[PDB]
């Protein structure tokens, strides 16, 4: 389980969970709040 | 060393080509030049009188043909003179055409020949 | 000498150690990095098997194991493109109208505006219009309800649970030896035998059993809810012997050898399907039923255990002429223990497959409603051709890995590849020699062209008014072709194509397929061609025989397959490796297959696709072919200009997103530009100042920033180059096609 | 008046398109070539 | 050790004959004439191409370039373990002794040897090039 | 002819000269760092300016430099 | 017992080193009266892999 | 008001576009049923742009003779006439989590550099390190306002490397 947790601290895995979980709030945001133009 | 083949190794391939002018080895220069000037005259008249600009008018297609035939020989007869001055500048046996003086005879022989070939090319046609 | 079973038990110990050691299959990577160059290294060489180790056995089992992984990922795939077809498409709705209902499997979630791209596909659907033709495919197969997709889709994704586990099974339980690998003759037996021609015969029983019937009744007006079930009709004789009289004698015609009573669902019709567009499917059965018995007939012939059979060294051995020394000597060994060899050959007839299943799938549409979708027939044709040229790009290039690191003096001292090396001079001198004449006489004809046009001299063109070139072989050829079946096909009904001549077949008002016509245009696009594929075989056969010496580099083989350069010695030695000529060769594939699928869609769309009137055929572009493709101008503003409109102004419909990528395909594509022309020397000294501001900052990295390497610069400019151009056309492709057609 | 003659065009163009750059391009060429003693 | 001389009446290993061979330049500049001695026949890879079998003995063959004798040495001497010797020959007849120039491979040191293009300096130490500018031709300052 | 130049920071390592494909370089003895030899360009007459010695140099900066100078038909390495 | 102590931490003045302002551990001195004496090893590779290098004893610093 | 421009609830332009969009979807939406997917997305998408179109008139922007809103970039123009929203605030919050994301990633390098193998823990992130120091980021400008006055942000000339000039 050591080795599987280091695998997935390695720079691709890490770099697809925290891109896709940025990708998920802003398109949760957008989508709660949709066209937002302007403060 | 090499690699040798039937096509660069045959006899009757040898033959054809010592058998031409350009490699007799023997004559002069300007006999040479007179001769493969009329041969590719009479062949050099063909295109331009077939193909050029001015083919589909008669009377005068094979006019132009022959002028435009005669200018391509003399192109290629100032192309020869300057080829031979820029290749023999200093220094079996020797063949005599290559030299400055072999190479500027068979010029002027080229040139005549060209032209020779080119007007009896035209009368062929009549 | 004998051919069994030999595998080594537990080899590889299942772990994640491994998985958490970067470049551990590397000695060189499994250092650790120091500069960012590693981290392009650890991705470059990850599946060059044959530099990790050098025992063939580990190889071929890592080759045997990957092709386990990639038959896994394209089961997923088709269990994709079948769950997408049963859940987010419109089959059953197209299956009532198919010439009026767009083919839609993909629908988008609506946020940030994007649900514009769900189009009015048809049938109370809103969706993406595909172009992968799944939907003609399946209406071919006999499917009529999205269940039967559901379960394809779970069908597929068991198997490729099944191919994973057949991968780590095969490389860490069960592993074959490299005696098991080098039964050539075994595994041609099987796959001519077993694979092919089985295949055939389980898709000619499907084809007997499920599309024959269900075709039928689909072309004679039957809903798709009142067709019988596929199994309703395996079950009983009755309702097959309705549709076929011969099915009411069983299968005693085919063992009493009175095969002629099956002549109602095994039939040579040709031609094509007059209400779908399509080959007649008896026509296909029959079809697979011959292709399965030549196939099992050719799996016969190669010896494994027993006296009968051949064995492929004595026949290689036993060809020798008094031209070639000794022959075929040594490339049975060659290619028994060299992967790269055999990629190279399956590679190159691989992509030369490919383009022939294009050209033949247009030219004879088997499915049905498929000759009528002209945007499936555009994109099938392009992306089979790309893939083809690909693959054979693919194909010098593994045949360069192979001359540089298992070509072996020793065992080709007089061979046909020696000798080929020997005059390797001649050979690429005579192919540049005509390389030059096919440019000249292809491309200045067109320069001739435009020139006396713009002089005002239109006599003096290359064209069918004036001087012409007309394909006499091809015409000749094309007669022969469509006078075939009252001479020399006395039980073909008709021929093969209808591109040969004769008349038209429409379905829905639209011209399905009608004879093409062959002039000048078409003569300077086939020397265009045919220049184009010569200049990219002098590239790749350049980089070929000249990858291990030159007169410029006597060691070449020394430096290996991909090094950048010998230094600036010699003149300049910039790209003297295969894998430069691999680089160029990529280019001009791209030149000669862009060329190819232009005149495809331009003569398509002009002297083939259209719509039916009274008395007469409007084509699309109305015949502007003959015209206008002898100029350069021509193919500029009637082939580019006037088609990319429907591209350009695609914006605010379902379209717009291609008109996006054709914008976005631009910028790729000039990114290329900046990785071609560059070199890595002024990069490394950019990063050094930007270096510099972080160290000023402490927030310069502990791996060291270095540029792109000679090598990855040109991969990034070759890749970003095809991935720009093929997308542009791809955009401009479809966007047209779905938009007119 | 330096109006040139109507046939100055059918003279001039040909010279310094035919004429001149060939005698140029064989002087040139010759010059090229040439040997140092 | 004393400068080897060329033996024109030597035996050349077996080949068929290539494209790559010799050129004018051969007949008209000049040319290299590789020798070596071989423990038994063996198969070895021309470095114009193709694969030739070296005989029991002597074995002679010409190069149109230096680069090809070298590359032909470096392979006898890290596969085979020989030691061969070229020479430049000039259409006149003049043979000039190439390598080992000394005898002894340069790749170890030997006596007699007398440093050339030697900088007792670093290259940090190099001057600026305007104190090198106005010389006679174009001049690195490295070169001073 | 191309120039080649030898520095004093040369540790005598000869990897230069073992990777020299046309033999200019070589070795001679000096009393200047722990291997006692110094490498050498004594026939730079034939040297194409290939760098294969600056590559395989391990100083910093490097002890053998190559000045790309006069072009002829060795340096060239032409065969014709 | 000429230069700096072995395995102490020298900074490197020679100006077209690429560890120059570097911080590089000593690996021994040559104690003869060559040029460069002081061998230093550095955590970074140069451009040309190399982690290690001559210097003499004014081109060294302790820092 | 600002460079000539109307606001965008005064502008004939604006309402022109309004009605346009409602109107292609309109047409569009005509061809199919009453209760059927295509209406509902439609209907919804009907609706998200009447929300959009008023959602922008309500927010003060400033619409041009294209009916199109405008920005203004200008700090004083913004806080003078209320539009301090379109670019004032936003500028503010970008620097706010572009100078969080720098922060943390320079307090990870400076943390690792410390370490056997820093080279290592840049490959395979350390996730509770990184972790830790994304959520300790908060107070970043703060932080660096005082690293920036203890003169512990920036490093010394002398340990950077240069060029030989």
Redesign the interface.
């Given at each position: 389980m050591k080795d599987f947790t280091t695998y997935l601290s390695t720079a691709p895995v890490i770099a697809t969970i925290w891109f896709t979980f940025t990708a998920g709030l802003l398109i949760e945001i957008n989508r709660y709040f949709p066209d937002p133009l302007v403060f | 060393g090499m690699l040798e083949t039937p096509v660069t190794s045959a006899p009757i391939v040898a033959t054809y080509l010592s058998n031409l002018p350009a490699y007799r080895t023997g004559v002069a220069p300007v006999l040479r030049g007179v001769e493969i000037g009329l041969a590719h005259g009479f062949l050099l008249a063909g295109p331009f009188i077939k193909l050029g600009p001015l083919r589909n008018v008669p009377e005068t297609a094979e006019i132009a043909g022959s002028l435009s035939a005669a200018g391509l020989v003399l192109?290629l007869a100032?192309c020869l003179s300057?080829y031979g001055?820029?290749?023999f500048?200093?220094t079996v046996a020797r063949d005599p055409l290559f030299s400055a003086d072999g190479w500027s005879e068979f010029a002027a022989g080229f040139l005549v020949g060209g032209e020779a070939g080119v007007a009896w090319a035209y009368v062929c046609t009549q | 000498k004998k051919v069994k079973i030999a595998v080594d038990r537990n080899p590889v110990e299942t772990s994640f150690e491994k998985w958490a050691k970067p470049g551990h299959f590397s000695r060189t990577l499994s250092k650790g990095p120091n500069t960012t160059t590693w981290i392009w290294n650890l991705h470059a060489d990850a599946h060059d098997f044959d530099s990790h180790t050098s025992d063939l056995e580990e190889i071929s089992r890592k080759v045997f194991s990957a092709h386990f992984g990639q038959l896994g990922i394209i089961f997923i795939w088709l269990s994709g493109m079948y769950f997408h077809g049963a859940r987010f498409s419109n089959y059953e709705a197209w299956l009532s109208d198919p010439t009026h209902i767009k083919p839609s499997a993909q629908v988008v979630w609506p946020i940030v505006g994007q649900e514009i791209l769900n189009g009015d596909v048809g049938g109370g659907f809103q969706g993406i219009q595909i172009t992968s033709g799944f939907f003609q495919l399946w209406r071919a197969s006999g499917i009529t309800s999205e269940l039967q997709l559901y379960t394809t889709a779970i069908g597929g994704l068991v198997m490729a649970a099944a191919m994973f586990f057949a991968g780590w099974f095969h490389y860490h339980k069960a592993a074959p030896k490299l005696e098991w690998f080098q039964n050539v003759e075994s595994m041609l037996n099987h796959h001519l035998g077993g694979l092919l021609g089985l295949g055939s015969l389980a898709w000619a029983g499907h084809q007997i059993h499920v599309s024959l019937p269900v075709n039928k009744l689909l072309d004679a007006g039957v809903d798709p809810k009142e067709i019988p079930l596929p199994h309703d009709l395996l079950l009983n004789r009755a309702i097959m012997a309705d549709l076929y009289p011969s099915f009411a004698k069983g299968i005693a015609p085919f063992f009493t050898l009175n095969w002629s009573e099956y002549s109602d669902f095994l039939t040579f019709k040709g031609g094509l399907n007059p209400v779908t567009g399509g080959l007649w499917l008896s026509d296909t059965a029959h079809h697979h039923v011959a292709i399965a018995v030549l196939f099992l007939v050719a799996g016969h012939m190669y010896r494994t255990n027993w006296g009968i059979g051949h064995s492929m060294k004595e026949i290689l051995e036993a060809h020798r002429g008094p031209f070639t020394g000794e022959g075929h000597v040594g490339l049975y060994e060659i290619l028994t223990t060299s992967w790269h060899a055999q990629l190279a050959i399956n590679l190159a007839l691989f992509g030369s497959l490919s383009i022939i299943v294009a050209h033949h799938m247009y030219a004879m549409p088997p499915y049905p409603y498929l000759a009528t979708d002209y945007g499936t027939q555009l994109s099938l044709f392009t992306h089979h051709t790309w893939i083809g040229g690909f693959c054979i790009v693919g194909a010098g290039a593994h045949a360069a890995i192979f001359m540089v690191r298992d070509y072996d003096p020793t065992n080709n001292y007089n061979n046909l590849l020696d000798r080929v090396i020997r005059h390797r001079d001649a050979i690429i001198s005579h192919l540049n020699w005509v390389c030059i004449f096919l440019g000249f006489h292809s491309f200045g004809l067109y320069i001739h062209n435009d020139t006396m046009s713009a002089l005002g001299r239109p006599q003096d063109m290359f064209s069918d008014t004036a001087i012409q070139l007309q394909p006499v072989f091809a015409q000749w050829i094309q007669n022969t072709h469509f006078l075939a079946p009252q001479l020399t096909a006395p039980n073909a009904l008709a021929a093969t194509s209808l591109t040969w001549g004769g008349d038209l077949v429409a379905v829905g008002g639209k011209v399905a397929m009608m004879p093409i016509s062959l002039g000048t245009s078409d003569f300077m696009v086939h020397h265009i061609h045919a220049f184009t594929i010569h200049v990219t075989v002098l590239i790749l056969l350049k980089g070929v025989l000249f990858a291990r010496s030159s007169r410029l580099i006597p060691d070449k083989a020394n430096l290996g397959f991909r090094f950048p350069c010998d230094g600036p010695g010699r003149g300049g030695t910039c790209q003297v490796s295969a894998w430069d000529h691999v680089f160029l060769g990529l280019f001009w594939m791209y030149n000669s297959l862009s060329i190819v699928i232009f005149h495809f869609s331009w003569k398509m769309q002009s002297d083939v696709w259209g719509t039916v009137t009274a008395s007469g055929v409007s084509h699309i572009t109305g015949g502007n072919f003959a015209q206008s493709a002898n100029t350069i101008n021509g193919w500029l503003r009637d082939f580019l200009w006037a088609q990319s409109s429907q591209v350009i102004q695609s914006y605010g419909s379902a379209l717009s997103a291609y008109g996006l990528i054709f914008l976005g395909a631009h910028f790729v594509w000039a990114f290329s530009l900046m990785f071609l022309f560059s070199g890595r020397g002024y990069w490394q000294e950019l990063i050094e100042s930007i270096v510099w501001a972080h160290n000023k900052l402490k927030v310069a990295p502990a791996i060291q920033p270095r540029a792109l390497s000679i090598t990855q610069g040109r991969a990034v400019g070759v890749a970003h180059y095809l991935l720009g151009g093929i997308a542009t056309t791809w955009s401009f492709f479809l966007a047209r096609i779905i938009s007119v057609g | 008046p330096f109006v040139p003659p109507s046939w100055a065009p059918s003279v001039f163009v040909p010279l310094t398109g035919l004429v001149l750059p060939?005698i140029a391009m064989?002087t040139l060429?010759?010059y090229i070539?040439?040997?140092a003693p | 050790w004393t400068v080897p001389t060329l033996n024109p009446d030597t035996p050349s290993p077996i080949f068929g004959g290539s494209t790559g061979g010799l050129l004018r330049k051969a007949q008209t500049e000049e040319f290299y004439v590789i020798t070596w001695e071989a423990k038994k026949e063996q198969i070895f890879e021309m470095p114009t191409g193709g694969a030739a079998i070296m005989r029991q003995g002597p074995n002679l063959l010409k190069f149109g370039k230096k680069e090809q004798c070298l590359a032909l040495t470096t392979q006898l001497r890290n596969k085979f373990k020989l030691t061969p010797c070229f020479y430049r020959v000039f259409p006149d007849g003049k043979v000039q002794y190439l390598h080992p120039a000394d005898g002894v491979y340069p790749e170890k040191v030997n006596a007699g040897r007398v440093g050339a293009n030697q900088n007792m300096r670093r290259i940090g130490q190099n001057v600026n090039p305007i104190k090198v500018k106005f010389s006679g031709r174009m001049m690195s300052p490295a070169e001073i | 002819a191309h120039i080649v130049k030898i520095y004093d920071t040369c540790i005598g390592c000869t990897q230069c000269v073992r990777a020299c494909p046309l033999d200019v370089l070589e070795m001679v003895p000096w009393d200047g760092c722990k291997a006692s030899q110094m490498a050498s360009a004594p026939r730079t007459e034939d040297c194409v300016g290939c760098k294969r010695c600056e590559t395989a140099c391990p100083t910093d900066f490097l002890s053998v430099r190559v000045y790309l100078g006069s072009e002829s038909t060795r340096s060239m390495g032409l065969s014709y | 017992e000429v230069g700096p102590k072995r395995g102490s931490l020298v900074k490197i003045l020679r100006p077209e080193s690429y560890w120059f302002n570097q911080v590089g551990k000593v690996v021994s001195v040559d104690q003869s009266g060559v040029r460069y004496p002081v061998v230093v090893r550095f955590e970074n590779q140069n451009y040309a892999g190399v982690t290690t290098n001559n210097y003499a004893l004014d081109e060294v610093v302790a820092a | 008001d600002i460079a000539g421009l109307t606001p965008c609830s005064e502008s004939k332009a604006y309402a022109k576009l309004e009605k346009k969009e409602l109107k292609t979807l309109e047409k569009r939406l005509k061809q199919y049923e009453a209760d059927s997917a295509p209406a509902v997305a439609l209907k919804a998408t009907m609706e998200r742009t009447k929300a959009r179109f008023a959602n922008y008139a309500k927010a003060g922007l400033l619409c041009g003779n294209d009916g199109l809103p405008h920005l203004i970039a200008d700090p004083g123009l913004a806080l003078k006439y209320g539009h301090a929203g379109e670019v004032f605030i936003p500028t503010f919050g970008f620097l706010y989590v572009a100078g969080y994301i720098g922060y943390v990633g320079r307090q990870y390098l400076i943390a690792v550099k410390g370490e056997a193998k820093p080279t290592d823990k840049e490959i395979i992130i350390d996730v509770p390190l990184a972790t830790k120091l994304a959520w300790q980021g908060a107070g970043w400008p703060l932080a660096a306002v005082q690293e920036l006055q203890r003169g512990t942000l920036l490093e010394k000339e002398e340990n950077i490397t240069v060029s030989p000039r």
């Open positions: - | 192109i100032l300057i001055s820029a290749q500048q200093s | - | 060939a064989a060429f010759v070539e040439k040997e | - | - | - | -």
